[PDB]
């Protein structure tokens with residue numbers, strides 16, 4: 437029983453776990469706590485890059501953005517390296533997805549603009565995709581720090597799965613921008629030990645991870661069977677029982693993804 441397996445994993449990792457896979461032609465929706473709120477953490481960066489792509493001509497990717505010391509306020513593996521020269525919007529989108537760069541996300545929010553340093557416009561973008569659940573309220577690093585149960589900066593496995601489905605599989609973006617987003621996620625470097633670990637090598641996996649305080653570890657992916665049948669997989673978790681400094685546990689997501697892949701194969 438799948439629900440039983442997911443419950444075994446929650447006890448194993450002292451965690452709360454959320455899973456959603458949207459229904460297809462012959463597969464029923466997979467859902468476990470799928471309508472409970474979980475912190476986005478960095479998973480918001482996938483629809484953020486979509487919002488920025490949507491909002492501008494494609495060649496806005498070639499605009500150079502400059503920033504300095506006081507702009508580096510969170511984990512930023514790429515932005516720290518380029519602070520002296522700047523980064524184009526294209527580089528920022530690339531860093532935000534593939535390295536989960538926090539500074540790149542803040543600069544991309546600022547590019548999108550409007551109230552809340554871009555957070556209101558980001559939330560408005562999800563609303564345009566029919567997501568009436570998710571909300572972004574803060575930028576990096578504060579967006580990962582809301583206490584357990586607090587609705588600020590949250591989504592649900594169900595809501596984010598349907599957003600990602602529209603972005604990658606559906607028509608939310610024109611084909612050229614849709615390919616940009618899909619390729620960045622295909623080239624992600626942070627996800628080898630999460631959804632990717634749960635699916636056999638001959639399944640294609642693209643993803644965007646999230647990690648935060650209270651032992652938060654998320655992964656949202658699109659996967660394709662060896663015959664090109666796609667599925668959207670949203671896995672979210674926290675270990676709030678360990679307090680603010682609880683260790684995020686990727687293995688939980690790998691195991692949950694293995695359970696999902698078992699059902700989809």
Ligand SMILES: *C(=O)[C@@H]([C@@H]1N=C(C(=O)O)[C@@H](S[C@@H]2CN[C@H](C(=O)Nc3cccc(C(=O)O)c3)C2)[C@@H]1C)[C@@H](C)O
Nearest residue numbers: 477478479510511512513516536537538626645646647
């Ligand atoms: C968003 O969830 C959060 C990001 N997202 C992360 C993720 O999805 O894994 C991590 S960043 C990822 C895991 N940690 C390493 C890291 O710290 N790399 C690194 C390497 C060299 C330099 C630097 C640096 O200068 O900062 C970092 C990569 C993270 C929790 C927030 C912050 O967006």
